[PDB]
Design a protein around this ligand. Structure first.
Ligand SMILES: *[C@@H]1O[C@H](CO)[C@@H](O[C@@H]2O[C@H](CO)[C@@H](O[C@@H]3O[C@H](CO[C@H]4O[C@H](CO)[C@@H](O)[C@H](O[C@H]5O[C@H](CO)[C@@H](O)[C@H](O)[C@@H]5O[C@H]5O[C@H](CO)[C@@H](O)[C@H](O)[C@@H]5O)[C@@H]4O)[C@@H](O)[C@H](O[C@H]4O[C@H](CO)[C@@H](O)[C@H](O)[C@@H]4O[C@H]4O[C@H](CO)[C@@H](O)[C@H](O)[C@@H]4O)[C@@H]3O)[C@H](O)[C@H]2NC(C)=O)[C@H](O)[C@H]1NC(C)=O
Ligand SMILES: O=C(Cc1ccc(Cl)c(Cl)c1)N1CCc2cccc(Cc3ccc(F)cc3)c2C1
Ligand SMILES: [Ca+2]
Ligand SMILES: [Ca+2]
Ligand SMILES: [Cl-]
Ligand code: NA
Ligand code: NA
Ligand SMILES: [Zn+2]
Length: 807
């Protein structure tokens, strides 16, 4: 019930939301069908439109008008945005030359520069260049302020997940808005774009910026706007709020536009019809900026112009139908479109089997335009699994396509309407969106590299003097956007210090069931090998310091001629293995006599070692090496590579991938990048939370042993950004690429895996590209501890994702 008989007189776009049954006058009252009876009359005035004209200048105030051109309007805070231009000979903001904003130039009683977030739905990154001729206000923001060529959204690349990520700094799995449509099985409730369940606060986790502000004594404008409030009225409302007295005035505001998304769905991302929506958004930006100029706030406010996601060409004819793959299509529920999520139609059907559905959807048609995954097998970079609202079966849909359950869903919802859609993998170029920051706290005429939208919450907090709630940004990684208000983090403290074992065991103390043809024997070279075991080559192979272990554990540093490792006594294998391969390195084979060679490590007890007999008895599991024998510096150094302490468990199907990486790709990268430093290791994430598993979370072991089986293997591949300098003698910034490969017992993910590894392995590895920071979370390790570079620069490097998309 609402008693809509109250009135909005003096309450128009009130900030505090009043409680039912009392009627509302706030910017969401329309959406709840709760506005007072006189809301339209008083709060949504339209009389005489949005612009002063010469005949209205100095008019007698008429309170019916949408905005005012009377002498008193500036003091009332309710002039039309073009008032000073039309009536007082002033210029539009866009026509003024850019002049650096070195310090905030704010009116008296402003405690901090305000922040205005101007969010645009469906604003694809390439619109900034492609539309620049019809967007002069936006172009001025971009050229004069701080901009990125693009900003990466989160997956899925849909509106609600992305706007809520912008507001919280959290991945959708953590904030709980995992799609525009969701089913929560604990609630037994559905969230939809249409309807009222989405108003329930139990959907919305984390702590959005408006709550962070309010809790810390910073007042916030409401970020949401009912669709029927016209944009001109949204801007005039923000500008009116900015004229409030100091104790009442918010410091943070958001504007939201449904364009260009709305038109993009109908016309495609570059339809001729798209020019007009871009012009109109630009006009709205111009209104805001002219408005700020009138209030003398144009060199005081920080303005963020930001999108939620891009837009791709998608039509009804590019739809895959699950009815063409499954016999049982009526026994499933599909969330359809540019991603798929499958669950059982009935939890009473015990014959529902996710394994049989996955298999029926795997590599069945030669040009198949989606790929099925159990959610835990999705690329870790998507961070899309640790939420009960995410169904176990996921379909990654190729760009330009849809998936649906049956054809009747597509033409009974028989011709096609739409030409654009979004939601695809967040690395896809068409899904990228925009970031511009303009104002005293941002840099002047500065281009920054692309970054992820999860990072902005921290920065918005920095812009407002707020302490951020715990989030998925890496605070400091965007300091290069800012003139001032930078956040100066300290490196985390190392929790576990390593042991440095010497030679402590005789060969005959080991009974591991291993063999090696190595009984082959000089004081020149004897001292020399001793020195390698004490760390004499460590400066070449450990270039950025040893990684720090940020949890409590027992581990040993092991040195060798060609590689250094941090060996876990608890997991019986390295946490990390570090080695440098120069441009000139030679690849060699594993010699015949060493094919099955595994050698005890006399620095590490038998009790803390793996054993070969476990691998012999486990018919499913084989082993690989972290430092590859193929890249040994000499025949004698190669023996080190067969130490039991360099062995890790690997499924034969995975060994195909791993061997190709090690034998072919590492050397290829060293040739292309002028040397590389490689750090490789295992990851255990059995509960798919993106975080390092403790020992008691491990679900699988090599049969009959305590050797845990990794869920993934990582590598971090670092070189000099200036590739004229070799990796191991680099004076300046670094360049990195990394991956987190799923450790799977089949290559079902790769439909062409019967072919030579040169036709499918690198494609697999690109799909599983990762940030250094992703590996940090998954391992509890902290990398790049000892470089010449600033810590903020290193944080930016740790958040870099190598995407393998063209321009
Ligand atoms: C990205 O950044 C985020 C934010 O930093 C990281 O997420 C955090 O990760 C922490 C570790 O996983 C986690 O800490 C836990 O907090 C529990 C208390 O949680 C409530 O309170 C917080 C604080 O206000 C709140 O934010 C939480 O909100 C979650 O849940 C509600 C629903 O109730 C949602 O609305 C919201 O969207 C959010 O859901 C997300 O997180 C939860 C996990 O909390 C997931 O289940 C969801 O799927 C979704 O992803 C909560 O309301 C606390 O109780 C936990 O403590 C247990 O574990 C510790 C280990 O130290 C153990 O010592 C304790 O004994 C305890 O165990 C007991 O309970 C167990 C489970 O029932 C049981 O098995 C045991 O036997 C014990 O009885 C834990 O410390 C933190 O909550 C989240 N925060 C958020 C916002 O998500 C995230 O990791 C980052 N991601 C990456 C990849 O880095
Ligand atoms: O206002 C809106 C239309 C809307 C109308 C009615 C209702 Cl009933 C609702 Cl729910 C939403 N939307 C779009 C969806 C959405 C989702 C999450 C968060 C927001 C707020 C937001 C705004 C700017 C920003 F940079 C970040 C977040 C937004 C902003
Ligand atoms: Ca959107
Ligand atoms: Ca985990
Ligand atoms: Cl209403
Ligand atoms: Na085996
Ligand atoms: Na395959
Ligand atoms: Zn859309």
């Amino acid at each position: 019930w609402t008693a809509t008989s109250g009135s909005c007189k003096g309450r128009c776009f009130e900030l505090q939301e009043v409680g039912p049954p009392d009627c509302r006058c706030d910017n969401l009252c329309k959406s709840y069908s709760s506005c007072c009876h006189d809301f339209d009359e008083l709060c949504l005035k339209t009389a005489r439109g949005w612009e002063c004209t010469k005949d209205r200048c100095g008019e007698v105030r008429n309170e019916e008008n949408a905005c005012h051109c009377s002498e008193d309007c500036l003091s009332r805070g309710d002039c039309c945005t073009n008032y000073q231009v039309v009536c007082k000979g002033e210029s539009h903001w866009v026509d003024d030359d850019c002049e650096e904003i070195k310090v905030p130039e704010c009116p008296a009683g402003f405690v901090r520069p305000p922040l205005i977030i101007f969010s645009v739905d469906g604003f694809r990154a390439s619109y900034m260049k492609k539309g620049s001729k019809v967007m002069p206000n936006i172009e001025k923001l971009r050229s004069c302020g701080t901009h990125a060529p693009y900003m990466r959204p989160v997956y899925p690349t849909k509106t609600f997940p992305n706007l809520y990520t912008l507001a919280t700094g959290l991945y959708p799995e953590s904030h709980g808005i995992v799609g525009n449509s969701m089913y929560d099985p604990v609630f037994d409730a559905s969230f939809h774009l249409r309807g009222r369940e989405k108003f329930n606060h139990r959907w919305w986790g984390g702590q959005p910026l408006w709550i962070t502000a309010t809790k810390q004594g910073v007042r916030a404008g409401t970020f949401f706007w009912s669709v029927s409030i016209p944009h001109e009225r949204r801007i005039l409302t923000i500008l009116q709020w900015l004229s409030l007295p100091d104790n009442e005035r918010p410091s943070v505001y958001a504007f939201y536009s449904e364009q260009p998304d709305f038109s993009g769905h109908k016309y495609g991302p570059f339809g001729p019809e798209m020019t007009n929506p871009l012009r109109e958004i630009d006009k709205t930006v111009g209104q805001l900026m002219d408005g700020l100029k009138q209030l003398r706030l144009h060199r005081c406010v920080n303005v963020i112009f930001v999108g939620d996601h891009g837009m791709e060409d998608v039509t009804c004819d590019r739809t895959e139908f699950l009815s063409n793959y499954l016999t049982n299509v009526d026994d499933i529920t599909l969330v359809p479109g540019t991603l798929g999520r499958i669950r059982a139609k009935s939890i009473n059907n015990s014959k529902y089997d996710p394994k049989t559905i996955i298999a029926a959807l795997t590599c069945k048609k030669p040009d198949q335009h989606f790929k099925p995954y159990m959610k835990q097998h999705l690329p870790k970079r998507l961070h899309y699994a640790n939420n009960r609202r995410i169904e176990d079966i996921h379909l990654l849909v190729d760009r330009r396509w849809h998936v649906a359950r049956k054809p009747l869903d597509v033409y009974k919802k028989g011709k096609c309407f739409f030409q654009g859609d979004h939601g695809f993998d967040n690395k896809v170029n068409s899904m990228q969106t925009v970031f511009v920051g303009y104002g005293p706290t941002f840099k002047y005429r500065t281009k920054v590299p692309p970054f992820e939208n999860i990072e902005l919450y921290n920065v918005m907090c920095d812009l407002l003097g707020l302490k951020p709630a715990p989030n998925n940004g890496t605070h400091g990684s965007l300091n290069h956007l800012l003139r001032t208000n930078t956040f100066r983090p300290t490196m985390p403290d190392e929790v576990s210090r390593p042991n440095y074992p010497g030679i402590m065991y005789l060969q005959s103390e080991f009974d591991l069931g291993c063999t090696c043809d190595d009984k082959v024997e000089n004081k020149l070279e004897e001292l020399n090998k001793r020195l390698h075991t004490k760390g004499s080559t460590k400066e070449r192979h450990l270039l950025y310091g040893r990684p720090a272990v940020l949890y409590r554990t027992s581990y040993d540093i092991l040195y060798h001629t060609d590689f250094e490792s941090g060996y876990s006594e608890i997991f019986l294998m390295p946490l990390w293995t570090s080695y440098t391969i120069s441009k000139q390195a030679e690849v060699s084979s594993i010699p015949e006599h060493l094919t099955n060679c595994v050698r005890p490590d006399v620095r590490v007890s038998p009790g803390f070692s793996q054993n070969c007999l476990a691998y012999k008895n486990d018919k499913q599991m084989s082993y690989g090496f972290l430092f590859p024998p193929y890249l040994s510096s000499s025949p004698e150094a190669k023996y080190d590579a067969f130490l039991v302490t360099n062995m890790v468990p690997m499924y034969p199907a995975f060994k195909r991938v791993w061997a190709y990486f090690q034998r072919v790709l590492v050397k290829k990268y060293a040739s292309e990048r002028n040397g590389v430093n490689v750090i490789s290791g295992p990851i255990f994430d059995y509960n798919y939370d993106g975080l390092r598993d403790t020992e008691d979370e491990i679900k699988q072991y090599v049969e009959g042993s305590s050797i845990p089986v990794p869920t993934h293997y990582y590598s971090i591949i670092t070189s000099c950004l200036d590739f004229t300098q070799p990796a191991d003698k680099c004076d300046g910034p670094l360049s990195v690429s990394s991956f987190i490969l799923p450790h799977r017992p089949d290559n079902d993910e790769s439909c062409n895996s019967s072919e030579d590894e040169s036709k499918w392995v690198e494609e697999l590895m690109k799909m599983h590209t990762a940030r250094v920071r992703d590996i940090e979370h998954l391992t509890g390790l902290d990398f790049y501890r000892k470089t010449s570079r600033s810590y903020s620069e290193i944080l930016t490097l740790k958040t870099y994702l190598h995407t393998y998309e063209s321009e």
